[PDB]
């Protein structure tokens, strides 16, 4: 506890002392490049020359989103999207590398334009650790 | 995240023996016992009983770093006495003292009515 640092009762921490929740919202849209040329939320795969991410696409459903129960980690793909070029090129959203948690809430709506808009919230319980500030 | 497993605190690892006995080079008829997966719960208690032994010339224990449950116990005894035996005896002395404390609590608890 020397020099503006402190000792914390672990038996207290266990009982839920100074314990907090954490949420992060990831967002995406199906951009319209010109006319009828639109992006598509789906679970992509090895089809011609798509530059897909190095994360787990397997956590995505057919709609190209995680179900709000699943535990997500590392660079696990949480929003699957594809942009076409004149087959398909990857436009997926991985999780923040430096983060991990459980999918809390997936929200599928429409943008003012009339295009698919999606928001993904991820939950984490953070526990008071050794280098934590107070 | 860089945090150990809570159970490591008491559960011996791969090839981890509860005791590691090494002779103290620095002094004659002296030893250093490394008690793995233990704390002051046992260390202070063993040291105290070792101190009761007349034939024990030295007894101390240290918890080198709080991240790891282990302690070194140093025992130096009078010539013609194995410190192992001093600890062997000091242990029985704790158990026998505790066995008495159990029975004498059970006696006093049976006496109570609330």
């Amino acid at each position: 506890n020397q020099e503006d640092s402190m000792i914390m009762n672990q038996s207290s921490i266990d009982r839920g002392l100074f314990r907090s929740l954490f949420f992060r919202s990831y967002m995406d849209q199906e951009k319209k490049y010109g006319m009828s040329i639109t992006e598509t939320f789906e679970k992509p795969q090895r089809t011609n020359t798509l530059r897909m991410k190095h994360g787990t696409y397997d956590k995505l459903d057919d709609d190209g989103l995680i179900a709000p129960g699943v535990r997500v980690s590392g660079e696990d793909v949480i929003i699957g999207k594809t942009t076409p070029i004149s087959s398909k090129r990857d436009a997926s959203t991985p999780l923040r590398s430096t983060e991990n948690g459980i999918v809390d809430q997936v929200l599928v709506t429409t943008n003012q334009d009339g295009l698919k808009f999606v928001k993904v919230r991820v939950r984490t319980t953070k526990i008071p650790q050794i280098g934590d500030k107070f | 995240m860089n945090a150990p497993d809570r159970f490591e605190l008491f559960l011996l690892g791969e090839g981890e023996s509860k005791l590691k006995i090494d002779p103290d080079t620095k002094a004659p008829n002296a030893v250093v016992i490394t008690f793995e997966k233990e704390d002051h719960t046992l260390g202070n208690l063993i040291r105290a009983e070792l101190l009761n032994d007349r034939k024990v010339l030295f007894a101390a224990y240290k918890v080198e770093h709080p991240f790891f449950a282990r302690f070194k116990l140093r025992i130096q005894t009078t010539e013609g006495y194995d410190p192992k035996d001093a600890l062997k005896n000091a242990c029985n002395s704790i158990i026998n003292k505790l066995g008495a404390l159990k029975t004498n609590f059970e006696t006093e608890w049976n006496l109570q009515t609330l």
Partner: protein
């Protein structure tokens, strides 16, 4: 009974396909939420 999406306001289980109108059945609301996996999640009671 089939579960894919839920409404935010009225909260009526919707279940619609890719390009099948983002609006809700009953109330003309464009706000939708996803199911939650049938993949039963486990936690440590700590």
């Amino acid at each position: 009974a089939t579960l894919k999406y839920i409404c935010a306001e009225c909260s009526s289980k919707l279940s619609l396909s890719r390009t099948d109108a983002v609006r809700c059945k009953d109330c003309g609301h464009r706000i939708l939420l996803k199911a939650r996996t049938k993949r039963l999640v486990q936690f440590e009671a700590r």
